[PDB]
mmCIF file of C-alpha atoms in Angstrom:
data_model
loop_
_atom_site.group_PDB
_atom_site.id
_atom_site.type_symbol
_atom_site.label_atom_id
_atom_site.label_comp_id
_atom_site.label_asym_id
_atom_site.label_seq_id
_atom_site.Cartn_x
_atom_site.Cartn_y
_atom_site.Cartn_z
ATOM 1 C CA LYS A 428 98.198 89.406 94.281
ATOM 2 C CA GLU A 429 99.002 92.581 96.154
ATOM 3 C CA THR A 430 95.962 94.780 96.222
ATOM 4 C CA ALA A 431 96.102 98.527 95.344
ATOM 5 C CA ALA A 432 95.614 99.362 98.833
ATOM 6 C CA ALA A 433 98.215 97.061 100.397
ATOM 7 C CA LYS A 434 100.763 98.459 97.445
ATOM 8 C CA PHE A 435 99.813 102.155 98.830
ATOM 9 C CA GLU A 436 100.809 101.216 102.246
ATOM 10 C CA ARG A 437 104.067 99.541 101.068
ATOM 11 C CA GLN A 438 105.003 102.449 98.892
ATOM 12 C CA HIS A 439 104.031 105.119 100.987
ATOM 13 C CA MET A 440 103.464 104.647 104.725
ATOM 14 C CA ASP A 441 106.004 104.872 107.261
ATOM 15 C CA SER A 442 104.210 105.233 110.548
ATOM 16 C CA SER A 443 107.372 103.977 112.604
ATOM 17 C CA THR A 444 109.508 107.186 112.038
ATOM 18 C CA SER A 445 108.220 110.791 112.704
ATOM 19 C CA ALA A 446 110.412 112.187 109.876
ATOM 20 C CA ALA A 447 113.629 110.991 108.117
ATOM 21 C CA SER A 448 116.784 111.614 110.199
ATOM 22 C CA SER A 449 119.706 111.090 107.974
ATOM 23 C CA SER A 450 120.362 111.764 104.436
ATOM 24 C CA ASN A 451 120.287 107.719 103.922
ATOM 25 C CA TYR A 452 116.705 107.469 104.627
ATOM 26 C CA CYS A 453 115.586 107.453 100.839
ATOM 27 C CA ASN A 454 118.161 104.907 100.000
ATOM 28 C CA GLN A 455 117.356 102.715 102.803
ATOM 29 C CA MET A 456 113.311 102.742 102.557
ATOM 30 C CA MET A 457 113.333 102.652 98.657
ATOM 31 C CA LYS A 458 115.451 99.544 98.764
ATOM 32 C CA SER A 459 113.634 97.826 101.738
ATOM 33 C CA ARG A 460 110.214 98.451 100.414
ATOM 34 C CA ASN A 461 111.336 96.944 97.269
ATOM 35 C CA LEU A 462 110.628 99.933 94.838
ATOM 36 C CA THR A 463 114.033 99.621 93.138
ATOM 37 C CA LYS A 464 113.695 95.675 92.366
ATOM 38 C CA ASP A 465 112.997 96.174 88.322
ATOM 39 C CA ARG A 466 114.398 99.478 88.063
ATOM 40 C CA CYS A 467 115.007 102.763 90.009
ATOM 41 C CA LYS A 468 111.453 104.519 90.586
ATOM 42 C CA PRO A 469 112.421 108.033 90.054
ATOM 43 C CA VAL A 470 110.425 109.641 92.574
ATOM 44 C CA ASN A 471 108.440 108.450 95.789
ATOM 45 C CA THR A 472 106.901 109.883 98.945
ATOM 46 C CA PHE A 473 106.781 108.467 102.271
ATOM 47 C CA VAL A 474 104.152 109.606 104.806
ATOM 48 C CA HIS A 475 104.874 109.566 108.615
ATOM 49 C CA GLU A 476 101.520 109.386 110.237
ATOM 50 C CA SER A 477 99.172 106.622 111.265
ATOM 51 C CA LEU A 478 97.421 104.602 108.490
ATOM 52 C CA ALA A 479 94.308 105.545 110.069
ATOM 53 C CA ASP A 480 94.958 109.361 109.452
ATOM 54 C CA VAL A 481 95.961 108.700 106.065
ATOM 55 C CA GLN A 482 92.814 106.576 105.307
ATOM 56 C CA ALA A 483 90.769 109.301 106.753
ATOM 57 C CA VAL A 484 91.961 111.638 103.906
ATOM 58 C CA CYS A 485 89.415 109.813 101.784
ATOM 59 C CA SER A 486 86.642 111.575 103.293
ATOM 60 C CA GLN A 487 88.432 115.294 103.343
ATOM 61 C CA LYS A 488 88.462 117.635 100.398
ATOM 62 C CA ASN A 489 87.678 116.347 97.005
ATOM 63 C CA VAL A 490 89.956 117.699 94.295
ATOM 64 C CA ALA A 491 90.646 116.741 90.700
ATOM 65 C CA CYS A 492 93.881 114.498 90.569
ATOM 66 C CA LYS A 493 96.789 116.039 88.331
ATOM 67 C CA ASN A 494 95.482 113.661 85.756
ATOM 68 C CA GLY A 495 91.843 114.946 85.721
ATOM 69 C CA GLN A 496 90.415 112.023 87.567
ATOM 70 C CA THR A 497 87.671 113.117 90.332
ATOM 71 C CA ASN A 498 88.606 110.471 92.862
ATOM 72 C CA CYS A 499 91.509 112.581 94.688
ATOM 73 C CA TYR A 500 91.259 114.208 98.040
ATOM 74 C CA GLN A 501 93.406 116.584 99.844
ATOM 75 C CA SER A 502 94.263 116.473 103.639
ATOM 76 C CA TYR A 503 92.611 119.108 105.625
ATOM 77 C CA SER A 504 95.992 119.236 107.596
ATOM 78 C CA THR A 505 99.854 119.236 106.861
ATOM 79 C CA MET A 506 101.616 115.813 107.348
ATOM 80 C CA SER A 507 105.266 114.817 107.929
ATOM 81 C CA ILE A 508 106.452 113.462 104.573
ATOM 82 C CA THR A 509 109.743 112.572 103.100
ATOM 83 C CA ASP A 510 110.404 113.147 99.272
ATOM 84 C CA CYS A 511 112.714 110.663 97.583
ATOM 85 C CA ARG A 512 114.355 112.062 94.340
ATOM 86 C CA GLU A 513 116.760 109.859 92.021
ATOM 87 C CA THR A 514 120.130 111.662 92.030
ATOM 88 C CA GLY A 515 122.556 112.060 88.848
ATOM 89 C CA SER A 516 124.687 109.169 90.351
ATOM 90 C CA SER A 517 121.646 106.817 90.451
ATOM 91 C CA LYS A 518 122.778 103.523 88.500
ATOM 92 C CA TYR A 519 120.325 100.413 88.381
ATOM 93 C CA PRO A 520 120.718 98.351 90.488
ATOM 94 C CA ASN A 521 122.586 101.038 92.571
ATOM 95 C CA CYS A 522 119.505 103.343 92.798
ATOM 96 C CA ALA A 523 120.613 106.494 94.759
ATOM 97 C CA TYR A 524 118.317 109.093 96.343
ATOM 98 C CA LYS A 525 118.106 112.504 97.609
ATOM 99 C CA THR A 526 115.891 112.682 100.815
ATOM 100 C CA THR A 527 113.880 115.834 101.459
ATOM 101 C CA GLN A 528 111.811 116.128 105.036
ATOM 102 C CA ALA A 529 108.754 118.426 104.831
ATOM 103 C CA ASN A 530 105.348 119.021 106.332
ATOM 104 C CA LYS A 531 102.658 119.426 103.841
ATOM 105 C CA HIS A 532 99.177 118.673 102.849
ATOM 106 C CA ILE A 533 98.973 115.448 100.766
ATOM 107 C CA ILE A 534 96.598 114.661 97.870
ATOM 108 C CA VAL A 535 95.817 110.740 97.464
ATOM 109 C CA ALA A 536 93.179 108.951 94.953
ATOM 110 C CA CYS A 537 90.562 106.666 96.749
ATOM 111 C CA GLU A 538 88.891 103.683 95.644
ATOM 112 C CA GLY A 539 86.791 100.551 96.743
ATOM 113 C CA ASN A 540 84.974 99.838 99.987
ATOM 114 C CA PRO A 541 86.106 100.529 102.438
ATOM 115 C CA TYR A 542 87.269 103.606 100.236
ATOM 116 C CA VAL A 543 90.832 103.893 100.945
ATOM 117 C CA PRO A 544 94.010 105.467 99.414
ATOM 118 C CA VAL A 545 95.458 103.577 96.387
ATOM 119 C CA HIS A 546 97.669 106.238 94.902
ATOM 120 C CA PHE A 547 99.739 109.153 95.974
ATOM 121 C CA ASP A 548 99.066 112.072 93.717
ATOM 122 C CA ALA A 549 100.824 115.106 95.047
ATOM 123 C CA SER A 550 102.098 117.052 98.434
ATOM 124 C CA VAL A 551 100.980 120.655 98.534
#
């Protein structure tokens, strides 16, 4: 059954692009990563870095997660991220997203051994 660590990679990693390059990125990626299968996931972030650099955040700065959990970590560095937010025209199964490209610090929740990212908490 898909592990939380593999789910994190499927929902949030895009190491094969340095940034989104068209306003269609989100529409394409959300669908291809199967995030719109049962319903339109309202918001999702993609990280354009190597997985190794993202797993390493689990050893960077410890911060409370937005929900008060103490297993969150904030990247020491800014990262290339694409934010995808549902549009007013989004209608299941035709989920429609606005693509935003930015460079920010990321916040993830880590668990297990090896200790790796399992949830994308926020970009700051």
